[PDB]
Design an enzyme around this catalytic site. Structure first.
Site, PDB file in Angstrom:
ATOM      1  N   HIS A   1       5.340  18.692  -6.845  1.00  0.00           N
ATOM      2  CA  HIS A   1       5.760  19.085  -5.511  1.00  0.00           C
ATOM      3  C   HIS A   1       6.907  20.090  -5.571  1.00  0.00           C
ATOM      4  O   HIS A   1       7.501  20.344  -6.619  1.00  0.00           O
ATOM      5  CB  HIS A   1       6.180  17.866  -4.690  1.00  0.00           C
ATOM      6  CG  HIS A   1       5.073  16.891  -4.441  1.00  0.00           C
ATOM      7  ND1 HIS A   1       4.882  15.767  -5.214  1.00  0.00           N
ATOM      8  CD2 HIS A   1       4.083  16.886  -3.519  1.00  0.00           C
ATOM      9  CE1 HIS A   1       3.830  15.103  -4.768  1.00  0.00           C
ATOM     10  NE2 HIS A   1       3.326  15.763  -3.742  1.00  0.00           N
TER      11      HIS A   1
ATOM     12  N   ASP B   1       4.833  13.449 -12.338  1.00  0.00           N
ATOM     13  CA  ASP B   1       3.821  13.366 -11.301  1.00  0.00           C
ATOM     14  C   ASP B   1       2.833  14.519 -11.352  1.00  0.00           C
ATOM     15  O   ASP B   1       2.072  14.714 -10.401  1.00  0.00           O
ATOM     16  CB  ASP B   1       4.493  13.306  -9.928  1.00  0.00           C
ATOM     17  CG  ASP B   1       3.545  12.890  -8.843  1.00  0.00           C
ATOM     18  OD1 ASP B   1       3.070  11.742  -8.896  1.00  0.00           O
ATOM     19  OD2 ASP B   1       3.284  13.688  -7.928  1.00  0.00           O
TER      20      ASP B   1
ATOM     21  N   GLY C   1       0.776  -1.220   0.000  1.00  0.00           N
ATOM     22  CA  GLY C   1       0.000   0.000   0.000  1.00  0.00           C
ATOM     23  C   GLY C   1       0.811   1.275   0.000  1.00  0.00           C
ATOM     24  O   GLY C   1       0.368   2.270   0.587  1.00  0.00           O
TER      25      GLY C   1
ATOM     26  N   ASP D   1       7.992  18.656 -11.416  1.00  0.00           N
ATOM     27  CA  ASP D   1       7.134  17.851 -10.553  1.00  0.00           C
ATOM     28  C   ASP D   1       6.091  18.708  -9.838  1.00  0.00           C
ATOM     29  O   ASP D   1       6.290  19.901  -9.592  1.00  0.00           O
ATOM     30  CB  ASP D   1       7.994  17.105  -9.530  1.00  0.00           C
ATOM     31  CG  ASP D   1       7.214  16.065  -8.750  1.00  0.00           C
ATOM     32  OD1 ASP D   1       6.001  15.905  -8.986  1.00  0.00           O
ATOM     33  OD2 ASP D   1       7.821  15.406  -7.885  1.00  0.00           O
TER      34      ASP D   1
ATOM     35  N   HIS E   1      13.417  15.283  -2.406  1.00  0.00           N
ATOM     36  CA  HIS E   1      12.931  15.648  -1.080  1.00  0.00           C
ATOM     37  C   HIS E   1      13.881  15.274   0.046  1.00  0.00           C
ATOM     38  O   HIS E   1      13.751  15.822   1.145  1.00  0.00           O
ATOM     39  CB  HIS E   1      11.569  15.004  -0.795  1.00  0.00           C
ATOM     40  CG  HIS E   1      10.431  15.620  -1.546  1.00  0.00           C
ATOM     41  ND1 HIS E   1       9.978  15.129  -2.750  1.00  0.00           N
ATOM     42  CD2 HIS E   1       9.655  16.691  -1.261  1.00  0.00           C
ATOM     43  CE1 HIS E   1       8.965  15.865  -3.169  1.00  0.00           C
ATOM     44  NE2 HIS E   1       8.752  16.822  -2.285  1.00  0.00           N
TER      45      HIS E   1
ATOM     46  N   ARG F   1      -2.222   8.671  -8.720  1.00  0.00           N
ATOM     47  CA  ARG F   1      -2.702   8.323  -7.390  1.00  0.00           C
ATOM     48  C   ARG F   1      -2.634   9.519  -6.452  1.00  0.00           C
ATOM     49  O   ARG F   1      -3.404   9.600  -5.490  1.00  0.00           O
ATOM     50  CB  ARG F   1      -1.875   7.173  -6.815  1.00  0.00           C
ATOM     51  CG  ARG F   1      -1.969   5.859  -7.563  1.00  0.00           C
ATOM     52  CD  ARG F   1      -3.312   5.190  -7.359  1.00  0.00           C
ATOM     53  NE  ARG F   1      -3.327   3.839  -7.911  1.00  0.00           N
ATOM     54  CZ  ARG F   1      -3.690   3.543  -9.153  1.00  0.00           C
ATOM     55  NH1 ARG F   1      -4.073   4.504  -9.981  1.00  0.00           N
ATOM     56  NH2 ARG F   1      -3.670   2.285  -9.568  1.00  0.00           N
TER      57      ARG F   1
ATOM     58  N   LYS G   1       6.281   2.756  -6.503  1.00  0.00           N
ATOM     59  CA  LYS G   1       6.647   1.403  -6.918  1.00  0.00           C
ATOM     60  C   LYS G   1       7.751   1.491  -7.958  1.00  0.00           C
ATOM     61  O   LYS G   1       7.455   1.744  -9.141  1.00  0.00           O
ATOM     62  CB  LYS G   1       5.443   0.662  -7.499  1.00  0.00           C
ATOM     63  CG  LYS G   1       4.257   0.509  -6.566  1.00  0.00           C
ATOM     64  CD  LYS G   1       4.608  -0.347  -5.366  1.00  0.00           C
ATOM     65  CE  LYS G   1       3.368  -0.741  -4.585  1.00  0.00           C
ATOM     66  NZ  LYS G   1       2.706   0.403  -3.919  1.00  0.00           N
TER      67      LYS G   1
HETATM   68  O1  LIG Z   1      -6.415   0.278  -8.971  1.00  0.00           O
HETATM   69  P1  LIG Z   1      -6.612  -0.237  -7.560  1.00  0.00           P
HETATM   70  O2  LIG Z   1      -7.909  -0.995  -7.382  1.00  0.00           O
HETATM   71  O3  LIG Z   1      -6.405   0.835  -6.511  1.00  0.00           O
HETATM   72  O4  LIG Z   1      -5.424  -1.320  -7.321  1.00  0.00           O
HETATM   73  C1  LIG Z   1      -4.016  -1.065  -7.139  1.00  0.00           C
HETATM   74  C2  LIG Z   1      -3.276  -1.525  -8.385  1.00  0.00           C
HETATM   75  O5  LIG Z   1      -3.616  -2.902  -8.651  1.00  0.00           O
HETATM   76  P2  LIG Z   1      -4.181  -3.599 -10.008  1.00  0.00           P
HETATM   77  O6  LIG Z   1      -3.064  -4.486 -10.517  1.00  0.00           O
HETATM   78  O7  LIG Z   1      -5.407  -4.377  -9.585  1.00  0.00           O
HETATM   79  O8  LIG Z   1      -4.503  -2.461 -10.956  1.00  0.00           O
HETATM   80  C3  LIG Z   1      -1.772  -1.415  -8.196  1.00  0.00           C
HETATM   81  O9  LIG Z   1      -1.116  -1.946  -9.366  1.00  0.00           O
HETATM   82  P3  LIG Z   1      -0.142  -1.162 -10.404  1.00  0.00           P
HETATM   83  O10 LIG Z   1      -0.841   0.142 -10.729  1.00  0.00           O
HETATM   84  O11 LIG Z   1       1.160  -0.963  -9.663  1.00  0.00           O
HETATM   85  O12 LIG Z   1      -0.002  -2.065 -11.611  1.00  0.00           O
HETATM   86  C4  LIG Z   1      -1.349  -2.224  -6.982  1.00  0.00           C
HETATM   87  O13 LIG Z   1       0.081  -2.134  -6.818  1.00  0.00           O
HETATM   88  P4  LIG Z   1       1.150  -3.360  -6.810  1.00  0.00           P
HETATM   89  O14 LIG Z   1       0.331  -4.612  -7.040  1.00  0.00           O
HETATM   90  O15 LIG Z   1       2.114  -3.078  -7.943  1.00  0.00           O
HETATM   91  O16 LIG Z   1       1.811  -3.331  -5.451  1.00  0.00           O
HETATM   92  C5  LIG Z   1      -2.039  -1.672  -5.749  1.00  0.00           C
HETATM   93  O17 LIG Z   1      -1.611  -2.418  -4.589  1.00  0.00           O
HETATM   94  P5  LIG Z   1      -1.112  -1.823  -3.160  1.00  0.00           P
HETATM   95  O18 LIG Z   1      -2.253  -0.972  -2.649  1.00  0.00           O
HETATM   96  O19 LIG Z   1      -0.835  -3.028  -2.285  1.00  0.00           O
HETATM   97  O20 LIG Z   1       0.136  -1.020  -3.460  1.00  0.00           O
HETATM   98  C6  LIG Z   1      -3.540  -1.830  -5.915  1.00  0.00           C
HETATM   99  O21 LIG Z   1      -4.199  -1.299  -4.745  1.00  0.00           O
HETATM  100  P6  LIG Z   1      -5.343  -1.991  -3.819  1.00  0.00           P
HETATM  101  O22 LIG Z   1      -4.601  -2.714  -2.715  1.00  0.00           O
HETATM  102  O23 LIG Z   1      -6.200  -0.855  -3.309  1.00  0.00           O
HETATM  103  O24 LIG Z   1      -6.098  -2.935  -4.733  1.00  0.00           O
HETATM  104 ZN   LIG Z   2       6.139  14.767  -6.931  1.00  0.00          ZN
END
Ligand SMILES: O=P(O)(O)O[C@H]1[C@H](OP(=O)(O)O)[C@@H](OP(=O)(O)O)[C@H](OP(=O)(O)O)[C@@H](OP(=O)(O)O)[C@H]1OP(=O)(O)O
Ligand SMILES: [Zn+2]
Lengths: 135, 506, 369, 499
Positions: C171, C257, C20, C169, C134, C263, C24
């Protein structure tokens, strides 16, 4: 913004007397894995890479690195294609299935995934995960 | 101005005039009975009343006095269908302005008011009939707000008959109900749990000699809606470190169940419930821009657009008056109190900045009354650049965008939790004392609670549930008071018990 | 016809912060893979960074800080308590398996990039791993542990009289503006978003303290700024900075960004906007150093950065994405350029004009170079 | 506001209608003095018939509620005009009367006979606002017949200030002894020769009013003359500034009375009681010791600001400093104060909205902070129009729900009950805070300052083309803007005029 001795960087003042000799006191920092070339037409490079993918296990990059390993000679690299192999880090049945058990009974704590895949480190777990979320 | 010269001539307008005439009439009139000129006799009483105050207050007496009839300059008048115990309240209202409303003799006043064209008392008896609308007198208040041409009390008296149609099928009033009324309570959205099909069929099977060829457009007009009888408990379980998002689907009465769970990897700095969907805000890191959206029918977290500000302990308000999630107040990253309002168009995933507050607060209890956000207490900027428990009331108006502090203050102060119910704002804070706040009359009433520590309010559908945070097992850690009798009972059936309630949403 | 180098170690996208967490590092790899299929690596000298030893990471950061980063691990967190509560490391900048090798890698790439850059070998130096702006001299901040930019500039100031730094950026680059807040050799121009927002610093009034007064440009913006506005405010101010300051090398922190949908974003730019920014900065014929940092919607970061490298060279690239390894990440359209959203900009023209005139007024007071 | 516990919004509570007094007010206003319905009593003035109601007349006044309840004819009033009782009816019913200077004193009589409290009080305010030398010895008599202290003081100040101009009239001739004792025994300035006017009063009867004559000469309080209208102005090439004072003459003429070039640099200044307090490296204060020429030292400010507003308060014997920039261009809102004697600055509540360069003016207590410039969108400043009242006693600062007809840097002068504001040209507003309204004048024609000596509004042009005499004397009763002189100084760019 904060001002003090432990906040800003100590910039060295400018004396031109040192803009000539240091040019060799600190060499190139980092390997040179690829460099463009004017001699070889990129059509023979497209053919070279197409052969490196179709007739061999190399990809879109190791053909370039291996091509630079022999100083831009296609035929020699073609001769050394059967030698080195694209290391198939095959996650077999037990590996992938136990990884699915760790990911279904744990989550994204790869330190815990390590406590049932103790042989593999962590960089390969994370590298496999991003290349595994496709399902 | 251009002609008014303060040394030659000008127009002196006295603005303390309206009170000196009113306090002149209510003190010189209904005390020394001086200067009377009409005698209103009702069911055996003579009332020595004045024509100038009765006519300058209700057009009915204005048309009854200044008339071409014979009883214009005679004397005695004999009113009919009204008692001598209601017309005394009408005199106490016309001459003074303060009437003592009671639920016993209410509808009568209502009716009588509408006959005398006293608009304010009619509107307040209409709102006070909208409060105390039971399940038994819900087809009589519906039938009563119809012969007076009143859409507000008709909608309020129709919502309850709609959301309680199951235990209404067998009442002898639902079998005599005419076609238009049933068409209105059916063509609105009866829930499936209130089984409306056998309700309409139970209605048709009465005088089917004349109702069969008259009640099929009803079945072509029947509808169905989802389930918005939720609570959404968000608290950190005693086991792991993540926080669950339990959904409480209440049954019919005196029982609350549990739907599903979701959990979340992140922390939460604020959360709201919009139209049955959950909206959480915040992250365990230092970028608390992030925001998520949950629902019982997806077990996911559809990420939403991030805020344009990094505030924690801000105030999320909802209510789909025009589809928007508001974020009022908050405490910044360097522990400063902000006073900026940003809102969220749910149909666009877009945040926008509107007019700012007048006092910066953090942790204020917000409550949306039909298109007006109230900020209740919280935490205020002191004077030595510190903070202090606040008593202020703020009234952001989400139609013209103009907030302004109300002059009066609350009884208690500090951290409080409030929920809107019918028309009032039930507030809890310093231990055990909930005050119901009436923003229209600008007044409070206490109520007192069990002596055994925090509390949280959630007005579910019909009643007001009161959850106490520290689930110490021994206590029944969940109550349910009846605001008309102050009967705090105990409801059971939490099933998946928590241990630390952070948010108890609507 | 300009030589371009590119720093990328095939090992940075394996360091995973936590569950979370917004940042990444995998996005880097995705960017790389697009550059490996557009055909933008036949014509770009690809290198491999050196693992930056902790003896050049000290010429800026304090010693106990670097010893802390080198001596910490998520198994023995309980042993270092007051240490991690004193260096901010723990809650926003989490400890994770790796950490100091990630810092070695980014810092090594950026520093080596500057070392080659000031020897008049290549002309454009690309590095999308570094750019962590930062981090501060003795503490971490905002996802960043070490400050690669200040190490790279400390490296550039050995051969160059004056160095310019540009912040795109969302920020405020407070670490690199703080680190050069007294000297007048480095000029930090930073376009950001100033309301109530991370990191909080970056007003219009805080300029320079000491010798380097009037040598720190902060351009505070508001939400939802679209592309045409960002161009109309980016071109004149930077032409004035080039005219008045007269730099010798440029360090662009091309933070992806501030695009349409992050996000954690708030602006409303597009990819072609950042492309016009890097093209304008690229059109001054100066030793240029592009960095990364920022960007939390991964697919948009990969698209943005690969089109940035498509601008650094000269080659045009089509919309259709060639066959890579990550179609399961790119949306159901398989196109490069993204589209803006519905957000309206609250900076109403005359705001940008009054701010811009304040900036010109601060820029006409610099001595000749 | 009260947390009642006997009443329940779901069973039993008390209704409290808010729009009741209004609705009955416009009820009687509407269906009475328009359609003329329910006419009760008939009041005859001179020869006109007035069909009036008894409940409203009894509600407003006590004279009528005591007249009607005397336990059936056309009652006739034998000492009011047909055109004044009409204003009394239009006040009792509508509550909005059109005042006028010609039929004002008459109302002051009748509004007291009928015990109309508000019309009597405001008729007194408008009667003491326009007292001149011609009618001060008659407005004193009028204030003494009706037992009005407020207007007796405002009628006595003008009488003792202009005493020499009255010592040979005729209202001063047949003057009772008590009024004269009230005039002379309060502080007559020596400029009018009070000693001679006493014996001059005595010779009017000589033989009778002489028994107390010697003891009447032991009763006055002769006092030295103060000083009016300071001009801290910058004249000639540098040479710092000045501190020109202006002794006022009752001959439509202003006079100079010694300079004080000893200056350094001034940021703000104000006049307290009868001396000059100056502030200007940026947090100090000197005093103008003009009797011995020399300045004096005082305590510094607890902080440092720019373009702050100094408002003198002789009531609490203090000086409030409000608003201003704080070195860096961020507007502040901190009100401090200085107690003369205690000589220690302190602190009070903050302003509602911050503002710098405003024009403060106190009305026997409340300090009105006019105009200035407030911060805008988003880092800068804009010329404001805000009105702020800083209740010096209760310590409550709150913004008025209305704005000025102009914005920017302005200069105000308290005069009588009114605040004469002026700004960026062809404008002169006369703000009245009690009834919340503005009245604009018209001026001849470039910022210019304003000052109030005693009974005239001297308006000063702060820029000269050398040789024009732009020091206008403003009479606001007839908007008569004259050109006075007698000043013998070459003061060019003057910074501000301290009334
Ligand atoms: O779009 P969301 O529903 O908020 O989901 C995200 C998204 O996951 P998906 O693969 O389902 O799209 C991210 O993926 P990427 O954008 O990086 O491809 C993932 O990050 P990682 O799997 O790469 O860690 C992240 O997970 P996390 O919150 O653990 O960082 C996860 O968020 P949710 O946990 O809210 O589903
Ligand atoms: Zn930034």
């Amino acid at each position: 913004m904060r001002v003090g001795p432990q906040y800003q960087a100590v910039v060295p003042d400018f004396d031109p007397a040192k803009l000539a000799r240091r040019s060799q006191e600190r060499d190139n920092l980092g390997m040179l894995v690829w460099s463009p070339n004017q001699n070889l037409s990129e059509a023979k490079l497209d053919e070279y890479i197409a052969i490196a993918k179709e007739k061999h296990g190399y990809n879109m990059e190791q053909a370039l690195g291996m091509l630079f390993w022999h100083k831009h000679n296609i035929e020699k690299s073609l001769a050394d294609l059967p030698n080195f192999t694209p290391f198939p880090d095959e996650w077999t049945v037990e590996d992938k299935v136990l990884f699915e058990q760790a990911f279904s009974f744990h989550g994204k704590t790869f330190h815990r995934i390590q406590q049932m895949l103790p042989d593999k480190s962590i960089a390969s777990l994370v590298k496999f995960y991003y290349s595994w979320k496709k399902t | 101005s251009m002609d008014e010269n303060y040394f030659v001539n000008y127009t002196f307008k006295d603005r303390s005039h309206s009170g000196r005439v009113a306090q002149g009439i209510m003190k010189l009139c209904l005390e020394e009975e001086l200067f009377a000129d009409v005698t209103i006799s009702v069911e055996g009483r003579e009332f020595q009343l004045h024509r100038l105050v009765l006519s300058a207050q209700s057009c009915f007496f204005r048309s009854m006095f200044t008339s071409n009839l014979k009883e214009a300059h005679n004397r005695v008048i004999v009113l009919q269908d009204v008692s001598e115990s209601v017309f005394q309240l009408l005199v106490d209202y016309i001459y003074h302005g303060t009437v003592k409303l009671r639920a016993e003799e209410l509808q009568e006043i209502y009716e009588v008011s509408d006959m005398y064209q006293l608009t304010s008392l009619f509107e307040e008896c209409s709102r006070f009939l909208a409060r105390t609308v039971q399940v038994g007198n819900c087809l009589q208040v519906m039938w009563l707000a119809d012969r007076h041409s009143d859409p507000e009390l008709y909608t309020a008296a129709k919502h309850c008959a709609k959301t309680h149609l199951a235990q209404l099928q067998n009442t002898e009033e639902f079998l005599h109900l005419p076609h238009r009324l049933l068409t209105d309570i059916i063509s609105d959205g009866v829930p499936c749990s209130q089984n409306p099909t056998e309700a309409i069929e139970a209605w048709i099977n009465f005088n089917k000699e004349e109702r069969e060829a008259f009640a099929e457009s009803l079945r072509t007009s029947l509808k169905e809606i989802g389930e918005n009888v939720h609570i959404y408990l968000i608290g950190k379980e005693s086991s792991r470190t993540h926080s669950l998002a339990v959904s409480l689907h209440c049954a019919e009465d005196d029982s609350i169940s549990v739907s599903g769970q979701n959990s979340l990897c992140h922390q939460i700095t604020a959360a709201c419930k919009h139209g049955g969907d959950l909206y959480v805000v915040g992250g365990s890191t230092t970028y608390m821009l992030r925001m998520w959206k949950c629902n019982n029918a997806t077990v996911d977290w559809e990420w939403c657009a991030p805020l344009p500000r990094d505030r924690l302990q801000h105030t999320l308000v909802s209510v789909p008056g025009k589809d928007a999630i508001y974020s009022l107040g908050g405490k910044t990253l360097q522990d400063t109190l902000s006073n900026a309002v940003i809102y969220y168009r749910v149909g666009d995933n877009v945040w926008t900045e509107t007019t700012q507050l007048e006092v910066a607060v953090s942790g204020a209890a917000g409550a949306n009354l039909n298109g007006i956000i109230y900020l209740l207490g919280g935490e205020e900027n002191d004077l030595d650049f510190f903070t202090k428990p606040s008593r202020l009331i703020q009234c952001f108006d989400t139609e013209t965008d103009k907030c302004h502090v109300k002059p009066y203050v609350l009884p208690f102060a500090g951290r409080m939790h409030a929920a809107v119910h019918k028309d009032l704002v039930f507030i809890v804070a310093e231990g055990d004392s909930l005050v119901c706040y009436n923003p229209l009359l600008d007044s409070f009433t206490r109520l007192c609670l069990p002596e055994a520590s925090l509390w949280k309010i959630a007005s579910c559908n019909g009643s007001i549930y009161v959850f106490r945070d520290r689930y110490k097992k021994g206590d029944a850690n969940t109550y349910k008071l009846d605001p008309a009798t102050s009967a705090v009972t105990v409801t059971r059936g939490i099933k998946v018990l928590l241990t630390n309630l952070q948010f108890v949403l609507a | 016809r300009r030589k371009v180098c590119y720093y990328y170690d095939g090992d940075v996208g394996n360091y995973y912060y936590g569950q979370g967490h917004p940042m990444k590092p995998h996005r880097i790899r995705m960017t790389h893979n697009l550059l490996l299929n557009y055909g933008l690596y036949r014509k770009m000298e690809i290198y491999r960074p050196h693992k930056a030893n902790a003896e050049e990471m000290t010429k800026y950061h304090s010693d106990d800080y670097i010893k802390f980063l080198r001596s910490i691990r998520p198994d023995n967190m309980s042993e270092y308590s007051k240490q991690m509560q004193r260096f901010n490391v723990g809650e926003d900048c989490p400890v994770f398996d790796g950490l100091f090798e990630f810092c070695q890698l980014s810092t090594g790439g950026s520093v080596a990039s500057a070392v080659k850059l000031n020897k008049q070998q290549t002309d454009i130096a690309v590095n999308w791993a570094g750019g962590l702006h930062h981090a501060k001299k003795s503490e971490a901040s905002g996802f960043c542990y070490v400050n690669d930019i200040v190490l790279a500039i400390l490296e550039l100031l050995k051969y160059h009289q004056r160095v310019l730094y540009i912040d795109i950026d969302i920020h405020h680059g407070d670490g690199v503006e703080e680190a050069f807040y007294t000297t007048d050799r480095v000029m930090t121009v930073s376009f950001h978003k100033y309301g109530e927002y991370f990191p909080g610093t970056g007003d219009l009034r805080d300029i320079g303290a000491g010798k380097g007064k009037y040598y720190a440009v902060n351009y505070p913006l508001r939400d939802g700024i679209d592309d045409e506005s960002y161009e109309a405010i980016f071109k004149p101010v930077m032409s004035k900075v080039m005219e008045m300051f007269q730099p010798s090398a440029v360090v662009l922190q091309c933070g992806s960004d501030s695009l349409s949908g992050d996000r954690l974003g708030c602006f409303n730019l597009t990819i072609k906007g950042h492309a016009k920014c890097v093209e304008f900065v690229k059109s001054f014929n100066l030793p240029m150093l592009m960095l990364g940092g920022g960007g939390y919607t991964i697919r948009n970061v990969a698209r943005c950065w690969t089109y940035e490298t498509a601008v650094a060279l000269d080659t045009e690239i089509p919309n259709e994405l060639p066959y890579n390894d990550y179609f399961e990440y790119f949306g159901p359209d398989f196109k490069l350029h993204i589209s803006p959203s519905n957000m309206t900009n609250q900076n109403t023209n005359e705001y940008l004009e009054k701010i811009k005139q304040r900036l010109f007024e601060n820029l006409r007071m610099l001595p000749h170079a």
